[PDB]
Ligand binder design. Structure first.
Ligand code: HEM
Length: 142
């Protein structure tokens, strides 16, 4: 279900993406927003109703990229600690469910992330396995 090699790949590839997140983070969000308009719709308050092709270089996007990195870094550092993973996922699920976000939408974010990580040496099958383990902890709380 989640092998030692899969965890090693996720950890090492995340460390490379993390080093470049200043530029990579906004590209990941744009990829997500172009593929799923229903996800971008949930960011209406943040972006003050602006069109999707204008948001990449705003301060708001830089802030969303920083929040995203901080949570994924916590998850990746605790891949052998289910108890810590569970706790972090419960908070995350509650906050997003409160905005009307669906489990399907979160899943879409993890599927875009898995392919986006190939650029940083990520094995997409490894990132899909880690997304599956985390969604099994998030989904029931949505
Ligand atoms: C793996 C997926 C994701 C991660 C790591 C992530 C992480 C976070 C974090 C750490 C925060 C700040 C804490 C909080 O207020 O909840 C945040 C806020 C937010 N996230 Fe997510 N997120 C994910 C997916 C999503 C998806 C798919 C959507 C929309 C459909 C979304 C919409 C939001 C919104 C609207 C906020 C508040 C923005 C603002 O400050 O106004 N996030 N997310």
């Amino acid at each position: 279900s989640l092998e030692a090699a899969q965890k090693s790949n996720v950890t090492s590839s995340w460390a490379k993406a993390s080093a470049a997140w200043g530029t990579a983070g906004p590209e990941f969000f744009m990829a997500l927003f172009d593929a799923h308009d229903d996800v971008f719709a949930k960011f209406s308050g943040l972006f003050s109703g602006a069109a999707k092709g204008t948001v990449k270089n705003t301060p708001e996007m830089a802030a969303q990229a920083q929040s995203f990195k901080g949570l994924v870094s916590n998850w990746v550092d605790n891949l052998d600690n289910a108890g810590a993973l569970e706790g972090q996922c419960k908070t995350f699920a509650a906050n997003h469910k409160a905005r009307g976000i669906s489990a399907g939408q979160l899943e879409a974010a993890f599927k875009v992330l898995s392919g986006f990580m190939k650029s940083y040496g990520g094995d997409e099958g490894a990132w899909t396995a880690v997304a599956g383990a985390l969604m099994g902890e998030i989904e029931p709380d949505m």
